[PDB]
């Protein structure tokens, strides 16, 4: 009978959480933001087309100098490009051709990759030998890696398909804390600007706000009908946007613990693969499976623009730290820079 | 352009040449994906043919790479899309499991669970034009067990002789009736541990798939 009592208590707690969230909903973003003029029509154009990949591109990350770019392809290749002159700076072969994530260290010294091999490979770029060699092979997950991000040069946050996330110390090579509480595979990560908290979306139609240092699930947001594939964080760290396969993007607030905005249209029936914000937070860019990307007004939920330069599924998006350009990568083996 | 920029351009050209050479080398490659219920002789078929395990071998003048994905006990629709360009799927089923059940089954059998996986794979979004090679493993024990209750538990609607041939034919027909794409074909084979000439069958099936795709491309069909 103890299990029944605990389940009833859990239901009562969920009802209390719902009641608490209801009282805070004294408005909505679309109503408060009705006093500001729209951004108008934004027509972005392709400035660079980065060729060289011979297969699908699965991940892409920008450097902190807004000039270097890293791309991962199922050919078994990571490529570090100069975004300005289209030159190829580095070509790192991989031990496993199945790569679904990549990351660029904030200091510009290290890169990361991972995939179905259940191993996160960290490569060092600044070496005395002149080549790029494997610095670490972090192992300990029981599933594929969906996203990996750097907190510093010795700490990395990974999310895997074994319904968990991990915080790895690179030098030791062992987990410092493990985040559990999801019931399904975790697909995306997004680090807060101050690197003290992060957000993790999973296939159980939920997202969770985790504290890095305490190793505990601070908050749990729901609302999506299907699995969440991509997640991103507002520049101030007080909001985050999630993309699912319901052809719907959702903007949540950390402080109010309530869903704020829903971006969806009747003419869109394809899922979202990558979500990114602008520097000022006014634009929200989301790549869809319909071979294109859409730019929404993040405060009024209007389709401000469409980028339609790809021939297959757009798998990765990125925005430079200075907000100068937006990089898109799709399964047609090409990277495009839009300004 | 300064001298350093010219040297950077030369380095980029060298990188591009290396990538093109690697792609040309990878062009001669036949990729296959191995799937099964997990106890249908997948390890046995791997031994005969010789996270994710890659098996390389070379038969006649072709280089086969088998992808065994059985440790990825997670949602299929989140990582199966990476195998969209696979040439073929080798699906392993156990005939001797027609009445064999597991403690976790809860009144279900090996059948109605392997057939469900076959139906999911055949009707998959990414595998509308990917042919499937089917191996009816453990034919000997299946034939020995059907002396009593020949396909009476798994298929109540079956009516025919208590012979291995007709029961295997009915099961194979049930497996082949799951294909709804005119461009997709299912190649069937009945194997056992004592029949090790199972690699020539895969070679011939791959050749037929390649010829069919080439003829579709040329429009001669």
């Amino acid at each position: 009978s103890e299990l029944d009592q605990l389940r009833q208590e859990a239901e009562q707690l969920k009802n209390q959480i719902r009641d608490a969230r209801k009282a805070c909903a004294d408005a909505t973003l679309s109503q408060i933001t009705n006093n500001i003029d729209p951004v108008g029509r934004i027509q972005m154009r392709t400035r660079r087309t980065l060729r060289g990949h011979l297969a699908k591109i699965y991940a892409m990350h920008w450097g902190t100098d807004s000039r270097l770019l890293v791309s991962a392809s199922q050919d078994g290749k990571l490529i570090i490009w100069d975004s300005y002159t289209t030159n190829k700076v580095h070509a790192i072969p991989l031990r496993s051709s199945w790569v679904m994530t990549c990351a660029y260290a904030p200091s510009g010294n290290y890169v990361a990759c991972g995939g179905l091999d259940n191993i996160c490979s960290i490569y060092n770029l600044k070496t005395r030998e002149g080549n790029v060699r494997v610095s670490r092979e972090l192992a300990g997950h029981t599933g594929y890696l969906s996203c990996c991000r750097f907190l510093d040069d010795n700490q990395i946050v990974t999310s895997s398909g074994d319904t968990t996330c991990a915080l790895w110390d690179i030098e030791t090579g062992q987990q410092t804390t493990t985040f559990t509480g999801h019931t399904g595979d975790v697909m995306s990560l997004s680090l807060a600007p101050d690197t003290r908290l992060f957000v993790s979306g999973a296939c159980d139609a939920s997202a969770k706000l985790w504290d890095v240092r305490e190793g505990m699930c601070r908050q749990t947001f729901t609302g999506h009908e299907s699995d969440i594939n991509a997640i991103c964080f507002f520049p101030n760290g007080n909001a985050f946007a999630t993309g699912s396969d319901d052809a719907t993007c959702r903007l949540f607030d950390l402080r109010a613990d309530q869903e704020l905005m829903t971006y969806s249209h009747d003419n869109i029936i394809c899922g979202i693969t990558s979500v990114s914000f602008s520097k000022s937070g006014r634009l929200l860019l989301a790549g869809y499976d319909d071979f294109n990307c859409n730019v929404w007004d993040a405060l009024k939920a209007d389709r401000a623009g469409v980028l339609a330069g790809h021939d297959n599924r757009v798998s990765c998006l990125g925005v430079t730290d200075d907000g100068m350009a937006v990089a898109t990568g799709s399964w047609d083996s090409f990277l495009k820079i839009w300004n | 352009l300064s001298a350093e920029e010219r040297a950077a351009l030369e380095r980029s050209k060298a990188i591009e040449k290396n990538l093109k050479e690697d792609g040309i080398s990878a062009a001669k490659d036949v990729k296959l994906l191995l799937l099964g219920a997990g106890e249908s002789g997948e390890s046995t078929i791997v031994k005969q043919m010789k996270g994710i395990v890659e098996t390389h071998f070379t038969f006649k003048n072709l280089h086969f790479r088998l992808f065994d994905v059985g440790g990825q006990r997670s949602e299929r629709k989140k990582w199966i899309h990476c195998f969209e360009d696979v040439t073929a799927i080798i699906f392993c089923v156990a005939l001797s499991g027609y009445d064999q059940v597991l403690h976790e089954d809860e009144t279900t059998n090996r059948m109605h669970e392997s057939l469900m996986l076959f139906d999911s794979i055949c009707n998959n979004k990414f595998f509308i034009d990917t042919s499937i090679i089917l191996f009816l493993n453990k034919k000997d024990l299946f034939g020995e067990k059907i002396k009593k209750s020949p396909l009476t538990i798994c298929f109540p609607e079956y009516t025919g002789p208590n012979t291995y041939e007709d029961a295997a034919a009915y099961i194979q027909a049930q497996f082949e009736s799951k294909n709804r794409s005119p461009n997709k074909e299912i190649y069937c084979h009945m194997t056992c541990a004592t029949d090790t000439n199972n690699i020539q069958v895969v070679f011939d099936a791959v050749t037929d798939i390649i010829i069919a795709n080439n003829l579709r491309g040329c429009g001669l069909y």
Partner: single-chain antibody
Amino acid sequence: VQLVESGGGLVQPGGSRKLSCSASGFAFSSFGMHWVRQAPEKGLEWVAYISSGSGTIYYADTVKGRFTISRDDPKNTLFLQMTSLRSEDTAMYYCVRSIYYYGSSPFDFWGQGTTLTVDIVMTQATSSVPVTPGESVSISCRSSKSLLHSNGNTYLYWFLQRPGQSPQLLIYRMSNLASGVPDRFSGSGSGTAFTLTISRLEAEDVGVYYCMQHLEYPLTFGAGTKLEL
């Protein structure tokens, strides 16, 4: 991380020699190589440059058509074949490693070199500076034309050579600090006038500091400023 040169010595006029350099500890096939000459009364003088493969080969106007650079990636060995030497070609040769990409630090590692006996002008303001330990010093150099390219880079290099040592890179592109060099050294300037500032002078800073232009070949070195206690 190691370059060993060999093949130098005394050669009679009109003869031929072959200097060689063996590389160990780095991916020699991915690095461009330079031969740089130093005479007792001339300072540093660039001899030749060979690219990462067998492409761009550059020679100085005083040696073009007389020397030949060859490369052997499998054995990681570089060769300089010299014919018809004169009293002018008496100097010490240094093999300089140099990798070129965005963010690279060219001229980072210098071999020991071997001693053999038989359009942009860079000017050093002073040949020596009286210095004392624990004080800050400034060394000034001038160029005949602006080294600030349109892309914002200023291709000026500051190297250090202590008595009995091969030069090591101090500053590349007039502002950056090479690996292994403490934050004591700094650099600034604009246009054609540049200044290297040493905030705190130690015993290891005594020696000759050289300026190099790398905007377009040939690369010209200055006379060199000698800081001595």
